Design a protein around this ligand. Structure first.
Ligand code: A1I5X
Length: 123
């Protein structure tokens, strides 16, 4: 499954190289430029828990690197070009950790997302 391909062949995009955020590009974007901390970002995504028990999907907007999303998003989206689509697999430490966000997210949950980056302007 899409998840498994990531956790076998997926690029480790953490600074610490702790494999906590793994990424595959599924469709390539256009331009050299990827967004900077503080940009307004516009994406479509779908998402699931590894548990298979909860699913979620978006025109989703957030300010990159401003902590409005999970650390994995701030890391993962910043590596994306306009019009790109990618798969992120994420360990709990770059998501909702040991505490989780009950009841939606349990303790120590792993997450998978599919993300298309549409546009980012400056703030
Ligand atoms: C529908 O809105 C949610 C989507 C997700 C998690 C949420 O809260 C835990 C949600 O409810 C509260 C609002 O979002 C808070 C931030 O959520 C996030 O940072 C990440 C990254 C951006 C997409 C939304 N995110 C989510 O974690 C989803 C999860 C994805 C896994 C299945 C359950 C829902």
């Amino acid at each position: 499954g899409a998840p498994a391909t990531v956790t076998e062949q997926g690029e480790d995009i953490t600074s610490k190289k702790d494999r906590g955020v793994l990424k595959i590009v599924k469709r390539v974007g256009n331009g050299e430029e990827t967004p900077m901390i503080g940009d307004k970002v516009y994406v479509h995504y779908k998402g699931k828990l590894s548990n298979g028990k909860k699913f979620d999907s978006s025109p989703f907007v957030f300010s990159l690197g401003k902590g409005q999303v999970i650390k994995a998003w701030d890391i993962g989206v910043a590596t994306m070009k306009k019009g790109e689509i990618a798969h992120l697999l994420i360990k709990p430490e770059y998501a909702y950790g040991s505490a989780g966000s009950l009841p939606k997210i349990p303790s120590n949950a792993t997450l998978f997302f599919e993300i298309e980056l549409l546009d980012f302007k400056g703030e």
